[PDB]
Amino acid sequence: KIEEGKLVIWINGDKGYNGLAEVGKKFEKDTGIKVTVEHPDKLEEKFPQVAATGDGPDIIFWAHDRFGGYAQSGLLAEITPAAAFQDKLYPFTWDAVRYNGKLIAYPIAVEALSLIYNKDLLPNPPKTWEEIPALDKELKAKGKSALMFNLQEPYFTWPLIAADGGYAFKYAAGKYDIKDVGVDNAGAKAGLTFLVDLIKNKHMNADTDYSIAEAAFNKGETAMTINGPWAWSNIDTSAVNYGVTVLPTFKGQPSKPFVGVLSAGINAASPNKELAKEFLENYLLTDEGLEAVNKDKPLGAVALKSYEEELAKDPRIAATMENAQKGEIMPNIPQMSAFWYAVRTAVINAASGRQTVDAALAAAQTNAAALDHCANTVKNFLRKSIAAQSYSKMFSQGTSFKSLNLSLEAPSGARSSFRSLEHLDKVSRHYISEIIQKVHPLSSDERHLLSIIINSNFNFRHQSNSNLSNNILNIKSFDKIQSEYSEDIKEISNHDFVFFGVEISNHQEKLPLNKTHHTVDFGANAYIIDHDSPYGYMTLTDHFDNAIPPVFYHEHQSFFLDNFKEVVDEVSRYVHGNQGKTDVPIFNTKDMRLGIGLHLIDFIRKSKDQGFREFCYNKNIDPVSLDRIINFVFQLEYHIPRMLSTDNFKKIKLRDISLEDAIKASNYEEINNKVTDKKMAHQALAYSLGNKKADIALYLLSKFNFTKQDVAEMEKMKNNRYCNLYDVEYLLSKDGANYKVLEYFINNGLVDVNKKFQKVNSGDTMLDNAMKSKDSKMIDFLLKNGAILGKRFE
Amino acid sequence: TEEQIAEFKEAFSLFDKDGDGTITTKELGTVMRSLGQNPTEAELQDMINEVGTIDFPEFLTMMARKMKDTDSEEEIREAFRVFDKDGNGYISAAELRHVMTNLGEKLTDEEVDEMIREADIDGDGQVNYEEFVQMMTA
Numbered sequence: 041k042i043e044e045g046k047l048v049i050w051i052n053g054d055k056g057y058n059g060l061a062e063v064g065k066k067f068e069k070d071t072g073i074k075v076t077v078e079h080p081d082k083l084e085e086k087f088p089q090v091a092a093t094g095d096g097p098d099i100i101f102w103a104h105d106r107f108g109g110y111a112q113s114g115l116l117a118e119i120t121p122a123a124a125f126q127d128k129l130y131p132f133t134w135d136a137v138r139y140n141g142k143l144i145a146y147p148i149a150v151e152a153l154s155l156i157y158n159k160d161l162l163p164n165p166p167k168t169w170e171e172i173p174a175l176d177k178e179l180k181a182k183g184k185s186a187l188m189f190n191l192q193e194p195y196f197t198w199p200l201i202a203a204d205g206g207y208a209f210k211y212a213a214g215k216y217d218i219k220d221v222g223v224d225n226a227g228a229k230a231g232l233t234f235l236v237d238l239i240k241n242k243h244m245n246a247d248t249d250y251s252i253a254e255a256a257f258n259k260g261e262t263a264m265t266i267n268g269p270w271a272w273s274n275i276d277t278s279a280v281n282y283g284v285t286v287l288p289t290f291k292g293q294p295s296k297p298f299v300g301v302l303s304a305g306i307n308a309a310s311p312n313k314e315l316a317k318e319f320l321e322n323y324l325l326t327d328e329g330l331e332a333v334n335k336d337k338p339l340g341a342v343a344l345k346s347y348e349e350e351l352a353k354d355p356r357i358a359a360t361m362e363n364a365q366k367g368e369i370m371p372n373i374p375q376m377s378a379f380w381y382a383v384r385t386a387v388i389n390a391a392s393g394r395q396t397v398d399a400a401l402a403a404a405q406t407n408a409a410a411l412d413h414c415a416n417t418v419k420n421f422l423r424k425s426i427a428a429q430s431y432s433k434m435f436s437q438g439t440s441f442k443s444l445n446l447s448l449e450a451p452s453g454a455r456s457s458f459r460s461l462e463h464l465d466k467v468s469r470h471y472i473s474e475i476i477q478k479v480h481p482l483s484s485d486e487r488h489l490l491s492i493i494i495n496s497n498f499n500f501r502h503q504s505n506s507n508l509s510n511n512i513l514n515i516k517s518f519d520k521i522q523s524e525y526s527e528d529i530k531e532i533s534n535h536d537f538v539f540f541g542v543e544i545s546n547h548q549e550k551l552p553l554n555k556t557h558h559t560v561d562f563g564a565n566a567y568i569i570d571h572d573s574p575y576g577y578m579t580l581t582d583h584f585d586n587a588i589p590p591v592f593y594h595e596h597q598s599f600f601l602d603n604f605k606e607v608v609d610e611v612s613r614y615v616h617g618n619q620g621k622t623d624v625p626i627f628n629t630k631d632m633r634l635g636i637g638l639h640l641i642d643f644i645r646k647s648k649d650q651g652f653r654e655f656c657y658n659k660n661i662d663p664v665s666l667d668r669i670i671n672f673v674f675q676l677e678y679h680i681p682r683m684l685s686t687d688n689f690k691k692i693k694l695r696d697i698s699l700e701d702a703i704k705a706s707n708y709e710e711i712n713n714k715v716t717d718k719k720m721a722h723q724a725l726a727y728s729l730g731n732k733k734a735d736i737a738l739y740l741l742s743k744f745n746f747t748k749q750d751v752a753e754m755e756k757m758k759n760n761r762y763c764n765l766y767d768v769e770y771l772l773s774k775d776g777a778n779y780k781v782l783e784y785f786i787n788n789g790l791v792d793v794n795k796k797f798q799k800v801n802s803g804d805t806m807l808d809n810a811m812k813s814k815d816s817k818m819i820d821f822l823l824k825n826g827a828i829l830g831k832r833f834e
Numbered sequence: 835t836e837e838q839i840a841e842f843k844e845a846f847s848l849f850d851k852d853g854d855g856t857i858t859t860k861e862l863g864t865v866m867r868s869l870g871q872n873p874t875e876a877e878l879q880d881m882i883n884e885v886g887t888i889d890f891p892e893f894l895t896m897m898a899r900k901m902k903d904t905d906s907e908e909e910i911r912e913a914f915r916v917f918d919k920d921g922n923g924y925i926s927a928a929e930l931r932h933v934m935t936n937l938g939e940k941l942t943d944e945e946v947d948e949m950i951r952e953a954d955i956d957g958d959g960q961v962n963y964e965e966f967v968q969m970m971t972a
């Protein structure tokens with residue numbers, strides 16, 4: 041791409057590219073090697089684009105701040121000047137082109153902004169920014185202005201932003217701290233507010249750019265401008281009698297220009313690195329070469345000691361260096377580009393009125409410091425901490441782990457450390473190694489099937505009769521729901537997990553494939569996510585009940601009873617490890633697919649059903665058949681710590697939710713949709729009492745005005761499974777969970793406390809039920825409200 | 835840059851068809867997917883460009899490339915400190931909520947509130963991130 045035997049040089053259009061071309065023509069006269077000098081627009085953006093593809097110029101010129109980024113991307117050759125050459129340039133200039141200890145460019149000249157002023161209009165230039173409004177007012181009497189300079193590039197406004205305390209990156213612990221940015225501190229806000237006020241008060245115009253300010257100063261329309269040494273040549277060509285001097289102070293502090301070292305880098309893709317070194321060291325960085333460039337457009341304070349000794353006698357150069365000494369050499373770290381972009385936007389928005397200074401600089405701060413990275417670090421850490429809490433609860437409260445060698449001591453502090461998570465990994469490790477040792481000599485068909493499983497994605501399905509989603513899907517763990525336990529729940533203590541069935545996903549069939557988990561349909565709303573969770577864990581069965589049932593219980597029983605034989609009498613079994621029936625294998629998300637595949641291989645290998653084996657070892661088994669097999673041999677159960685909250689899901693309505701299922705799930709949406717008149721309320725109240733949904737019962741009673749006659753009607757509901765069998769008063773009194781409903785019915789005169797049951801336990805009263813349950817509170821309530829004690833003959 | 839784990843020769847042995855300490859190139863990705871790695875097709879083909887069969891020596895070096903480093907306790911602390919306006923070591927629940935809601939990857943409000951509740955071990959509306967970060971290290 042870059043052609044050998046010539047040198048292409050890129051340099052900004054505001055520099056002396058014709059004088060550089062003369063240096064190139066001398067190089068050609070000595071060597072026969074042509075030098076082409078170009079000045080493309082947006083050079084500092086075009087160079088990394090074309091150079092990343094191995095194209096671009098042999099030599100790129102820019103201020104040094106851009107070069108570390110280039111060096112980090114691999115675009116620059118390391119330069120190799122020896123002691124003699126390095127001694128010809130000022131030491132601080134070499135420091136500007138050092139990146140990660142290596143020299144990545146030749147320094148050319150030091151650039152700093154100065155105040156340039158028209159001596160005929162303004163014989164004594166202002167010492168302070170603060171006096172510029174009054175100077176402008178004086179000059180406006182003759183239609184002239186005090187100051188114009190480029191407001192489109194933040195380089196020119198930075199000296200003022202920095203004057204009272206703004207900074208780019210603080211230097212600390214031997215480097216620029218990329219997370220200590222001073223773009224939105226008090227000093228930066230004060231400087232930019234001063235600029236914005238100059239514009240608001242019509243002393244400057246937000247649209248002024250480089251060309252406009254230059255034309256105005258060089259035609260005598262404005263008394264002052266802010267620019268670098270490269271601009272002096274055009275001022276010389278104009279009539280204007282000008283001076284170059286220290287930038288004005290702000291709040292009594294010097295303006296602090298960011299100082300650039302114009303530098304020449306060699307493209308890492310160049311086949312002309314030796315020619316480029318010869319040109320730069322022995323033609324350009326000489327008295328004659330720099331003089332030709334400088335005569336075209338002044339370079340500033342050149343890096344070459346021998347020429348700078350004379351250039352520094354120039355008061356304009358002395359003033360450049362005085363401003364530089366008040367400022368700061370720019371960092372060359374890769375973060376500079378983003379910094380400049382951020383500040384550019386802030387200046388332009390604040391100058392325009394599109395944003396306030398505070399808002400513009402706040403946004404620039406967040407961009408320049410890259411606070412997204414830190415916010416992500418915080419979020420990831422807190423997610424990991426939540427997961428560790430769930431896993432410590434499981435491993436430290438679950439008695440099954442104590443029966444095995446897998447318990448965790450309760451956490452030392454007020455929360456679990458990440459050890460629980462590490463424990464998980466080790467646990468999964470255990471169950472992986474074991475199963476590997478059981479099937480290590482793997483056959484070709486077994487390896488092919490394991491590979492098919494490894495490369496499969498999963499749908500994770502959670503069914504419910506609750507309304508768990510709107511735009512956001514929110515599923516809460518059992519422990520989280522109640523916090524807003526029986527010994528069976530204590531056996532595993534995974535009740536701070538959300539539970540999912542598992543399906544193969546790479547198919548175009550209607551979702552979900554399966555609607556039951558261990559024969560239970562958990563509800564009409566099937567919520568499906570299609571991606572793993574980093575802290576989930578998988579079991580091959582329900583964790584507490586690891587028994588696969590006979591085939592006539594399975595959801596797709598006819599497929600297996602039709603197509604297979606011996607496997608029908610093998611699949612019903614306990615799925616467990618070496619330590620016995622309660623040795624439930626546990627896999628983390630990393631190890632899931634391997635462990636599933638290996639356990640499937642083991643089952644298939646132990647099978648006498650050759651048709652089944654051949655069905656599984658079909659090299660072109662489609663994912664639906666694969667899911668059939670996995671959901672037959674196993675009841676995979678995936679667990680996600682604490683909660684699932686996401687906008688990335690599918691909801692599939694499998695069927696209507698029945699009234700009783702809605703009542704049982706406290707699905708107020710379905711309940712309100714269904715219970716619109718008094719007969720539906722009769723049904724819904726009976727269902728609430730039968731399922732001990734006291735809150736639902738009280739809601740219904742608040743929405744409808746129940747009467748004695750309503751209770752009489754409820755007694756006639758043979759189509760309701762509860763009132764078909766039981767009296768209303770029986771339902772009110774059978775379980776203490778309905779106490780508050782009973783109270784309601786008694787206090788509002790809806791039931792007779794002494795009504796004798798006419799259905800199950802006929803002749804009894806509510807007091808009989810209360811005494812049977814040993815519900816002291818209900819017993820006492822009934823007796824306080826006139827219950828009869830004892831039973832006489834009629 | 836790895837040891838003790840030895841990745842898994844175990845896993846390796848599952849795809850060693852002949853037991854010659856080598857596996858085929860076409861299976862490489864699969865063997866890395868069995869261990870929790872997701873290299874692109876381009877990176878797969880570029881690491882195949884280096885060598886078709888691959889042995890366990892070369893297999894270990896390839897997984898070390900893709901293996902990423904856990905964030906350190908110091909890095910977590912610094913990520914918290916950049917949002918600490920007072921430097922006291924505390925971030926208010928409102929400040930942490932603004933941060934985690936408006937910076938970085940989008941989460942639900944529910945997940946953000948759960949993270950805040952989990953981090954606020956005293957229930958005082960403030961999060962002592964230095965204590966909380968030191969506590970999470972075993």
Ligand SMILES: OC[C@H]1O[C@H](O[C@H]2[C@H](O)[C@@H](O)[C@@H](O)O[C@@H]2CO)[C@H](O)[C@@H](O)[C@@H]1O
Pocket residue numbers: 052054084102103104105106151193194195196300380
């Ligand atoms: O405005 C941001 C810009 O500032 C500097 O660019 C200067 C450059 O140093 C000078 O040589 C001269 O050409 O004016 C430029 C401002 O327009 C940074 O060097 C540059 O990276 C940055 O984007």
Ligand SMILES: NC(=O)c1cccnc1
Pocket residue numbers: 501502503504539540541557562677678
């Ligand atoms: N709610 C469910 O669908 C479910 C899935 C797997 C295990 N337990 C419950």
